[PDB]
């Protein structure tokens, strides 16, 4: 039905320190050769309440993509802590992977991410200002939230 079918996304290097780059091994199948490019993005949700704090970590144009199976590791630098509101830094946030074809988003894969301290004192008495050098990022990889939108593939 859809020219591009995403078969699987594997979260690599997880858990890891907050500052480590994100690494996702994506596998997708192309039913027919694609005339245009696929644009992949990784978006970090800095704040659940405000859109302005979403950070596009990386965007990649892959194309043209011939028919068959494609597998690639999408890597993106960790978010800029200078744009993460303090109240949202520690605890659960979301990381999204999106793909568009001809500007139309056809898949959105989201993971809940748990940012937490690893030292007992910090876990019991967290600092007023979040210490990103002491946070451990744990992408909850066992439960991805997926949405597939039916777009125009011509």
């Amino acid at each position: 039905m859809a020219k591009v079918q995403v078969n699987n996304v594997v979260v690599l290097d997880n858990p890891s320190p907050f500052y480590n780059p994100f690494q996702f091994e994506i596998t997708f199948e192309c039913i027919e050769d694609l005339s245009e490019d696929l644009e992949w993005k990784i978006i970090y949700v800095g704040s659940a309440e405000s859109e302005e704090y979403d950070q596009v970590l990386d965007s990649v144009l892959v194309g043209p993509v011939p028919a068959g199976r494609h597998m690639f590791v999408f890597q993106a630098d960790a978010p800029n802590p200078g744009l993460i509101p303090d109240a949202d830094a520690v605890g659960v946030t979301v990381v999204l992977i999106t793909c568009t074809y001809r500007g139309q988003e056809f898949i959105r894969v989201g993971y809940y991410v748990n940012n937490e301290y690893t030292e007992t004192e910090l876990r019991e008495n967290p600092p007023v200002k979040p210490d990103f050098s002491k946070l451990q990022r744990n992408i909850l990889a066992s439960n991805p939230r997926v949405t597939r939108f039916h777009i125009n593939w011509e």
Binding site: V94, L96, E105, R108, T147
Partner: peptide, 10 residues
């Protein structure tokens, strides 16, 4: 309902 904003991602 903290993630009600993200309801275009289950």
């Amino acid at each position: 309902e903290k993630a009600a904003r993200l309801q275009x991602x289950a």
